[PDB]
Design an enzyme around this catalytic site. Structure first.
Site, PDB file in Angstrom:
ATOM      1  N   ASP A 232      69.436  61.160-102.795  1.00  0.00           N
ATOM      2  CA  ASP A 232      68.437  60.985-103.624  1.00  0.00           C
ATOM      3  C   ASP A 232      68.978  61.981-104.890  1.00  0.00           C
ATOM      4  O   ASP A 232      69.961  62.934-104.720  1.00  0.00           O
ATOM      5  CB  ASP A 232      67.090  61.647-103.334  1.00  0.00           C
ATOM      6  N   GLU A 503      54.746  55.779-101.013  1.00  0.00           N
ATOM      7  CA  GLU A 503      55.195  54.640-101.608  1.00  0.00           C
ATOM      8  C   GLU A 503      54.343  53.252-101.414  1.00  0.00           C
ATOM      9  O   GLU A 503      54.071  52.773-100.078  1.00  0.00           O
ATOM     10  CB  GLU A 503      56.675  54.401-101.342  1.00  0.00           C
ATOM     11  N   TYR A 615      64.345  50.881 -96.454  1.00  0.00           N
ATOM     12  CA  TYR A 615      63.746  50.385 -97.794  1.00  0.00           C
ATOM     13  C   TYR A 615      63.974  48.651 -97.775  1.00  0.00           C
ATOM     14  O   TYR A 615      65.161  48.347 -97.499  1.00  0.00           O
ATOM     15  CB  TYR A 615      63.973  51.030 -99.066  1.00  0.00           C
TER      16      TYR A 615
HETATM   17  O1  IJ6 Z   1      64.201  59.775 -98.137  1.00  0.00           O
HETATM   18  S1  IJ6 Z   1      63.681  58.621 -98.475  1.00  0.00           S
HETATM   19  O2  IJ6 Z   1      62.326  58.413 -97.664  1.00  0.00           O
HETATM   20  O3  IJ6 Z   1      64.803  57.588 -97.916  1.00  0.00           O
HETATM   21  C1  IJ6 Z   1      63.653  58.511-100.101  1.00  0.00           C
HETATM   22  C2  IJ6 Z   1      62.621  59.209-100.897  1.00  0.00           C
HETATM   23  N1  IJ6 Z   1      62.739  59.665-102.389  1.00  0.00           N
HETATM   24  C3  IJ6 Z   1      61.815  60.486-102.840  1.00  0.00           C
HETATM   25  C4  IJ6 Z   1      61.445  60.459-104.356  1.00  0.00           C
HETATM   26  C5  IJ6 Z   1      62.850  60.006-105.134  1.00  0.00           C
HETATM   27  C6  IJ6 Z   1      62.471  60.088-106.631  1.00  0.00           C
HETATM   28  C7  IJ6 Z   1      61.348  60.644-106.909  1.00  0.00           C
HETATM   29  C8  IJ6 Z   1      61.119  61.899-106.291  1.00  0.00           C
HETATM   30  C9  IJ6 Z   1      60.769  61.509-104.788  1.00  0.00           C
END
Ligand code: IJ6
Length: 658
Positions: A232, A503, A615
């Protein structure tokens, strides 16, 4: 070249097959290639497909093996106790188990190249590792080899690492076949690649897939093109898109929907060892988490993504600042000039940079690409490149000038180090994208932007309303547009969580009635309902019959156009596991017209319970098939970072699911 040995239809039923008399005397020279077509839909935890061993007492560590784990990992060992050599090379998430409930024929190619001193493994047309060694060990030079074995390794006269599965075909060559030759070997892949290493993005990694079917019949996909491994932000990441005009059979060469040029687009093999794997591009601006919708009224395709200025990610983002200054009812982007301690500037109308302290316009302007001009002349910065040539990650200037952008590290004027949301549109269904524009703050001047939910926005069927879900601490924040995305308003729906990665994806159950499914911290997927086209939202409930881990995983969902068992249907895509991001499922729910409740009636297994699934994106294709584009690996696991070509696409029919 012809093979030196070839055999087939070996059933591996926890009992090795001895092929010593067929192969051992045929092996010669220092380079070899193994080509193996095999099935394993119920593997043991750790099993050898192929072994060459010294099976004599006292030489238990003199062998070559090809092995797999029930995690989908593939690997080799090359060992000789007299030479003092013990090589072990592998990559997680390299295999398929089942597709449409039938065992998948995996095509494995292993090249042992003495000239190059390199061991290279391909599975299903994908290179999964390539390891160069100082002291080469030809697989047939192991001291005292006396057994060739399928489905185990014979050590000291006993069968170790017994396999369950089958080998339909196995061939060996006394040569290291070239990359060109490898590419000619026929495959039986259950999947396709839309985005892949070496394509036009020049990203070696990809995460966060989306899919959306457009009214023309064209199917569109977006994705994080991630350059600095699978990390990320902070990192270098662009948003890329590709489309299919034949119901997903073929896909266009990707283009970018959102991109920064402060760092070079480099295809880099990110280190996977424990000392270096957390290396992270730290000076680049990036985009992350895209979402797509189509607007019926305008015909436009609309794509949103998070934007991160240089060096910023969720971790270090300035919470408590939107990056904007409200001045009599309007939000203006703030800027800090080189040498100042504070943000004394704003971007006013026409891109004019304004000094807030002196209240005068400056002779600087910001163009529509967020690039800095002085007296109308374009300023530039020098681009960075990255390398691990010094043994650690290095980020440095590469001699190339690019437009000075306010999101960049080297920029004379810099935005607030926090996260934003940007919007781009396409008037030609993904053939090109307009320059992005930042959305205004929705929760006040001193609140950092919300986080976009990746996947699809929602276009209401009986109106012009467009909705993109986002989240922040304590709520989902829905962004709503009734004017083709020109203006947005927010609708806040509180959730009983602090700081969850909530999400969320939406389905319209019927006209005006929206159900949102979202990731939580409880191990269960949650949902809420709006019965007024997103103006107001119910309290939170949870789905039974599906498990997630405590940290959760993104979930995707669509309303299927056709009845199933006489009922309206929703399809959900998610891992179904309490343990990790694995056990991918599509779950079919039938809607109860009386009360809008959903009967989760069918659970379709994407692949094995133990194989990776994170995902995902799902869409109903124009022919009513289902398209799935998904992370085929555990994208949480710290053991499965920086794998190439694990985001894969498959085509399913509704009868496959039921
Ligand atoms: O670690 S994961 O759950 O695979 C990916 C999570 N990304 C977090 C998010 C990323 C873009 C905006 C900030 C928070």
């Amino acid at each position: 070249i012809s093979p030196i040995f070839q055999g087939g239809s070996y059933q591996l039923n926890n009992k090795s097959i001895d092929i010593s008399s067929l192969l051992l005397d045929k092996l010669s020279g220092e380079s070899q290639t193994v080509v193996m077509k095999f099935k394993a839909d119920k593997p043991n935890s750790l099993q050898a497909l192929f072994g060459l061993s010294n099976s004599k007492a006292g030489f238990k560590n003199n062998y070559f093996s090809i092995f797999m784990r029930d995690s989908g990992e593939i690997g080799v060992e090359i060992r000789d106790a007299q030479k003092g050599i013990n090589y072990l090379f592998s990559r997680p998430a390299s295999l398929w188990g089942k597709h449409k409930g039938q065992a998948v024929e995996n095509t494995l190619v292993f090249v042992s190249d003495s000239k190059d001193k390199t061991y290279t493994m391909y599975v299903n047309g994908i290179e999964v590792f390539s390891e160069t060694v100082d002291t080469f060990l030809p697989i047939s030079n192991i001291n005292g080899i006396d057994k060739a074995t399928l489905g185990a390794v014979n050590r000291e006269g006993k069968e170790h690492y017994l396999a369950k599965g089958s080998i339909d075909e196995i061939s060996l060559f006394n040569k290291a076949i070239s990359d060109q030759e490898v590419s000619t070997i026929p495959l039986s892949n259950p999947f396709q690649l839309i985005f892949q290493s070496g394509d036009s993005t020049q990203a070696n990694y990809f995460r966060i897939p989306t899919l959306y079917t457009l009214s023309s019949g064209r199917v569109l996909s977006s994705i994080d093109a991630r350059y600095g491994g699978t990390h990320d932000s902070k990192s270098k990441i662009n948003i890329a898109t590709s489309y299919s005009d034949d119901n997903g059979k073929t896909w266009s060469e990707p283009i970018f929907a959102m991109k920064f040029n402060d760092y070079e687009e480099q295809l880099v093999y990110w280190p996977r060892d424990n000392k270096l794997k957390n290396s992270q591009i730290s000076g680049s601006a990036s985009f992350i988490d895209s979402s797509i919708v189509e607007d019926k009224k305008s015909g436009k395709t609309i794509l949103l993504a998070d934007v991160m200025p240089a060096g910023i990610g969720n971790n270090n983002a300035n919470k408590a600042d939107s990056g904007f200054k409200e001045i009599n009812g309007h939000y203006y982007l703030k800027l800090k000039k080189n040498g100042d301690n504070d943000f004394r500037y704003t971007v006013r109308e026409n891109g004019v940079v304004y000094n807030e302290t002196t209240n005068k316009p400056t002779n600087y302007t910001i163009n529509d690409k967020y690039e800095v001009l002085e007296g109308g002349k374009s300023l530039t910065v020098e681009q960075y490149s990255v390398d691990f040539d010094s043994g650690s990650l290095r980020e440095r200037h590469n001699g190339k000038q690019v437009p000075m952008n306010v999101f960049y590290k080297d920029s004379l004027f810099k935005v607030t180090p926090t996260n934003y949301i940007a919007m781009t549109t396409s008037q030609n269904r993904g053939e090109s994208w307009e320059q992005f524009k930042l959305l205004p703050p929705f929760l006040g001047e001193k609140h950092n932007g919300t986080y976009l939910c990746p996947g699809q926005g929602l276009a209401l069927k009986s109106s012009n309303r467009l909705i993109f879900a986002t989240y922040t601490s304590g709520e989902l924040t829905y962004l709503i547009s009734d004017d083709s995305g020109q203006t947005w308003k927010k609708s806040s729906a509180s959730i009983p969580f602090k700081n969850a990665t909530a999400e969320a994806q939406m389905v319209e159950l019927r006209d005006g009635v929206i159900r949102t499914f979202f990731r939580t911290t409880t191990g269960k997927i949650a949902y809420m309902t709006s019965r007024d086209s997103g103006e107001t939202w119910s309290k939170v409930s949870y789905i039974d019959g599906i498990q997630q881990t405590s940290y959760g995983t993104q979930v995707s969902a669509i309303k299927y156009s056709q009845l199933i068992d006489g009922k309206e249907a929703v399809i959900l895509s998610t891992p179904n596991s309490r343990s990790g991001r694995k056990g991918g499922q599509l779950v079919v729910g039938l809607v109860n017209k009386e009360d809008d409740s959903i009967d989760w009636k069918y659970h379709y297994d994407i692949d094995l319970p133990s194989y990776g699934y994170a995902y995902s994106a799902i869409t109903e294709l124009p022919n009513h098939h289902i398209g799935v584009l998904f992370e085929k690996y555990d994208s949480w696991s710290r053991n499965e970072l920086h794998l190439s070509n694990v985001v894969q696409y498959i085509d399913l029919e509704i009868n496959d699911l039921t």
